[PDB]
Write a protein that binds this ligand. Structure first.
Ligand SMILES: [Zn+2]
Ligand SMILES: [Zn+2]
Ligand SMILES: [Zn+2]
Ligand SMILES: [Zn+2]
Lengths: 246, 245
């Protein structure tokens, strides 16, 4: 069983015309895990896997562009249930330090909020997930996701920190946010530029780098060239439908 | 300047694959009004009009499938500000009887919540909008929207009530939720079926009928056919991209 990541949405903040914000489909065997659930994510996701075949959701943080589709997903589960597309409760994992956001993850018997613990690995079917707190204006967690043979790291949202490097060590794929260009500083917004994403990939010895949480200006391909001045492996710009597999 | 309605999203509850939930673009001359702002609505919207050219938003009620994209919208306004695209604050109209939901409409200087009053007509640019409380499990309002020449009525979400008829009287286009088929009762969930949508069009003497808030089962074309056994004017199933003018 190979591990397969499909980018569902990849824009920062809000979606470009016909595109989506943060959502990533992680699949192994029959298991389907959705990582983040932003704007237009469900619409796109259902082109790949129907609501009832989704096994779990995990959320890095509670910014609109990572959670806007949660309530629609809750409605999908409720209707699925009244349609007899199987009555199974959908677990949604998040941090519980923000009480009100976490409470909203639970909807009748249809979805169920489950607190992940930052200092302890989570098992979600065939996946193990470990966490790193990021530098972002709200509590937020990057994720090291493995199936035992391959490892994919998702930075979620963050400004640069050296701790990404031991955390991303030997990842087959690093999905790094890259909201800014080489000549810009994303510190005040809690974001990274392409040189920073390139630095993490190189220093961790990542096999491959995918740049995501994309900006709404500039030439995105410039983000690729800029990262490539630092990191020598494969680099790509995320888009809806982009697939990685190992 | 013709009045133009473009369906942005039209599924009930949650989007079908590559589609969207309640959203409708209302245009008149230079002005663009977004009626409801559900799931994948922004993504589709920006295909017709960019965030800075949006003049106002109005929300029928606070169910996920009508408001999910509000937060992303507020972020689009914010980033627009930083890019020099629009310093202009986007008004979002809604009822304020649900206090916490209403408070979420205002975001810094980027969007501004403005309370519409059910019993008083609202003037939004070239449009005048009047309201009818509907029968739904949360507070919700249908909308008669006119530019002085043409009138479009939007039922929003509701089970059947007679008051829709005088409310929809002589509408040029009636946009009616139609979450159920002829042989089903939508009362318990606050929704209507195809015969009820048809009944309103017929008795209000609506010029044309558009069925929306669509279900995720059955053959949608049957909604059209069933409605056509009561109403004799034109009847269509909503889809993203459908244009009435
Ligand atoms: Zn984000
Ligand atoms: Zn964020
Ligand atoms: Zn509703
Ligand atoms: Zn609805």
């Amino acid at each position: 069983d190979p591990m397969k990541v499909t980018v569902i949405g990849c824009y920062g903040g809000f979606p470009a015309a016909n595109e989506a914000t943060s959502g990533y489909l992680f699949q192994s065997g029959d298991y389907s895990l959705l990582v983040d659930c932003g704007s237009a994510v469900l619409s796109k996701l259902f082109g790949y896997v129907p609501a009832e075949k989704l096994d779990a959701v995990i959320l890095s943080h509670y910014h609109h562009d990572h959670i806007a589709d949660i309530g629609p997903l809750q409605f999908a589960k409720q209707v699925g249930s009244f349609l007899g597309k199987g009555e199974h409760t959908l677990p949604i994992y998040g941090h519980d330090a923000d009480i009100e956001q976490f409470q909203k993850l639970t909807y009748k018997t249809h979805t169920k909020g489950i607190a992940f613990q930052p200092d302890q690995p989570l098992t979600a079917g065939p996946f193990t997930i470990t966490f790193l707190k990021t530098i972002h204006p709200v509590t937020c967690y990057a994720m090291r996701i493995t199936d035992g043979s391959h490892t994919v790291v998702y930075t979620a949202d963050s400004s640069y920190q050296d701790s990404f490097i031991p955390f991303s060590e030997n990842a087959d794929l690093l999905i790094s946010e890259c909201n800014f260009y080489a000549d810009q500083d994303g510190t005040s917004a809690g974001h990274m530029n392409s040189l920073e994403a390139g630095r993490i990939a190189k220093e961790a010895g990542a096999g491959e780098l995918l740049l995501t949480h994309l900006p709404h200006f500039g030439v995105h391909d410039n983000l690729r060239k800029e990262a490539k001045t630092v990191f020598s492996g494969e680099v790509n710009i995320a888009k809806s439908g982009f697939v990685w597999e190992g």
